[PDB]
Amino acid sequence: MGPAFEFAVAMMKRNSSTVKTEYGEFTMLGIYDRWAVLPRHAKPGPTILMNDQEVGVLDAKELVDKDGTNLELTLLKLNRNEKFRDIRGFLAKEEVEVNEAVLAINTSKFPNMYIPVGQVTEYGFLNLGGTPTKRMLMYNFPTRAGQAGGVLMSTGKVLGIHVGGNGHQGFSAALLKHYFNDE
Amino acid sequence: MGPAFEFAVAMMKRNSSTVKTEYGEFTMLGIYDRWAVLPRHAKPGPTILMNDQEVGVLDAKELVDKDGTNLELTLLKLNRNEKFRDIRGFLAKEEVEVNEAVLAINTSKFPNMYIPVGQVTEYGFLNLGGTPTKRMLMYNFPTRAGQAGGVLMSTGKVLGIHVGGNGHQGFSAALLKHYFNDE
RNA sequence: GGCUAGCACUCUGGUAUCACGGUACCUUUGUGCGCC
Known part of the structure; x- marks a missing residue:
C-alpha cells in the first residue's frame, strides 16, 4: 500500500483507541507516556471508556493559545500501566x-x-x-x-x-x- | 484485565488480520516470516483480500497427517514485504x-x-x-x-x-x- | 524466585522494503506491570 x-x-494500531464519554464515541490518539489527545467537545469526566475498558483520568487540560483562544483539543493523562509509543x-x-x-x-x-x-x-x-x-x-x-x-x-x-x-x-x-x- | x-x-493486534476469500470472511493468524494459517474450508485462491486489500498468495499448503487424514488447516505464504512477529x-x-x-x-x-x-x-x-x-x-x-x-x-x-x-x-x-x- | 506467562514502552544493533518521509521483523538494554 x-x-x-x-x-x-x-x-492507529500503536497509538489510537476508541473512547466513549458522556458525549459520544471518539477516536483517541496517544502521544507519549500516558498522555493522549481528544477533541475538546469530548469533555471527559473522571473516567473514560477506552476500548470498552474503564480507565481513570489523572489530569485533563483544554488547550488555549497565548491569546486565550480556543484550540478545540483536550490533553488528558491516563491512569494506565501501558505507555503510548512516543x-x-x-x-x-x-x-x-x-x-x-x-x-x-x-x-x-x-x-x-x-x-x-x-x-x-x-x-x-x-x-x-x-x-x-x-x-x-x-x-x-x-x-x-x-x-x-x-x-x-x-x-x-x-x-x-x-x-x-x-x-x-x-x-x-x-x-x-x-x-x-x-x- | x-x-x-x-x-x-x-x-490480535500483532498477528491477526481479517481475510475474505471466495468462500467468506475469516480471522487469519500470522505465525512467522510470511506464513499464515486459515481453516481449510477458506480455500484461498491466487490472491486474498486482507483488511480489504488485495494480497497475492505465493504458496498454499493443506495439512494432512502421515496417513493422509484431513487436519482442516491451510498454510499460506503471503507476497508482502512485512514479516509477522515470530x-x-x-x-x-x-x-x-x-x-x-x-x-x-x-x-x-x-x-x-x-x-x-x-x-x-x-x-x-x-x-x-x-x-x-x-x-x-x-x-x-x-x-x-x-x-x-x-x-x-x-x-x-x-x-x-x-x-x-x-x-x-x-x-x-x-x-x-x-x-x-x-x- | 521462577513461570511450561506474559504485556507495554525505551534503547542498541541488524535484515527487508520504501514515493527515502517511513514501515515491518529481528537483536541488544533498561523501566513499569503481571504472575506459577
Missing part, C-alpha cells in the same frame, strides 16, 4: 500543508477506516459552534457525525485531529510539537 | 488441555470479540461436515456463522484455530509447533 497508508495503519518526532513545529493526506477513524461506526482527503491547507481562524478557535486545518471532504477525533496524517507526519466540518469541508485542530514538551 | 485477555489483545514459541509440541481459554475473532460479524471458553480437551478424531478429521480440540460453545478462524488461546499459548461445531460444542484444529519448522 501507499507509504502514507502504511504510516497510517501503524499509527510519536512527538512526527509532530511539527508549526502548521503543515500537504498535497495529499489520509484521515483515519477508529470507532464502532467507522471501523478501520482510512480516508484519502487530498489537499490540506492552513485555514487559521474559525467560529465553531459560536466559539472562536485558531490554528484550524481545512480539507475538502464531507464530514459526518462520529468522525471527531480522526487522525489527519501524511507519511511521517501527524497533522492534526478532526474536530468538525460543514458538509463539504473538514477541519482539524493542528497538532503542534510544543504542546507536548512538558504537559 | 486478565493476563489471557492482555495476551489475546496483543496477539510466535512459534507460543505453540506446543503436542495437544494441550487447559481449564480456561479465550476465542478471539475479528470479522465484520464478530468484530473485536473475545469469547471466554471453559475446559478445552483433546478430542482427536472427528467427522466434521462429512470429512474425517484428526487432532481436534473440543469445548462447549455456541455454533454461529463467521466464527471459523478464531484464535484459541491461553496466556502464552496459542492452542489452535476454531474450525466448526455441532450446535453444542466447538472444535479447533490444534496448532502444533512442528507444522512451522523453518524447513
Whole structure:
C-alpha cells in the first residue's frame, strides 16, 4: 500500500483507541507516556471508556493559545500501566500543508477506516459552534457525525485531529510539537 | 484485565488480520516470516483480500497427517514485504488441555470479540461436515456463522484455530509447533 | 524466585522494503506491570 497508508495503519494500531464519554464515541490518539489527545467537545469526566475498558483520568487540560483562544483539543493523562509509543518526532513545529493526506477513524461506526482527503491547507481562524478557535486545518471532504477525533496524517507526519466540518469541508485542530514538551 | 485477555489483545493486534476469500470472511493468524494459517474450508485462491486489500498468495499448503487424514488447516505464504512477529514459541509440541481459554475473532460479524471458553480437551478424531478429521480440540460453545478462524488461546499459548461445531460444542484444529519448522 | 506467562514502552544493533518521509521483523538494554 501507499507509504502514507502504511504510516497510517501503524499509527492507529500503536497509538489510537476508541473512547466513549458522556458525549459520544471518539477516536483517541496517544502521544507519549500516558498522555493522549481528544477533541475538546469530548469533555471527559473522571473516567473514560477506552476500548470498552474503564480507565481513570489523572489530569485533563483544554488547550488555549497565548491569546486565550480556543484550540478545540483536550490533553488528558491516563491512569494506565501501558505507555503510548512516543510519536512527538512526527509532530511539527508549526502548521503543515500537504498535497495529499489520509484521515483515519477508529470507532464502532467507522471501523478501520482510512480516508484519502487530498489537499490540506492552513485555514487559521474559525467560529465553531459560536466559539472562536485558531490554528484550524481545512480539507475538502464531507464530514459526518462520529468522525471527531480522526487522525489527519501524511507519511511521517501527524497533522492534526478532526474536530468538525460543514458538509463539504473538514477541519482539524493542528497538532503542534510544543504542546507536548512538558504537559 | 486478565493476563489471557492482555495476551489475546496483543496477539490480535500483532498477528491477526481479517481475510475474505471466495468462500467468506475469516480471522487469519500470522505465525512467522510470511506464513499464515486459515481453516481449510477458506480455500484461498491466487490472491486474498486482507483488511480489504488485495494480497497475492505465493504458496498454499493443506495439512494432512502421515496417513493422509484431513487436519482442516491451510498454510499460506503471503507476497508482502512485512514479516509477522515470530510466535512459534507460543505453540506446543503436542495437544494441550487447559481449564480456561479465550476465542478471539475479528470479522465484520464478530468484530473485536473475545469469547471466554471453559475446559478445552483433546478430542482427536472427528467427522466434521462429512470429512474425517484428526487432532481436534473440543469445548462447549455456541455454533454461529463467521466464527471459523478464531484464535484459541491461553496466556502464552496459542492452542489452535476454531474450525466448526455441532450446535453444542466447538472444535479447533490444534496448532502444533512442528507444522512451522523453518524447513 | 521462577513461570511450561506474559504485556507495554525505551534503547542498541541488524535484515527487508520504501514515493527515502517511513514501515515491518529481528537483536541488544533498561523501566513499569503481571504472575506459577
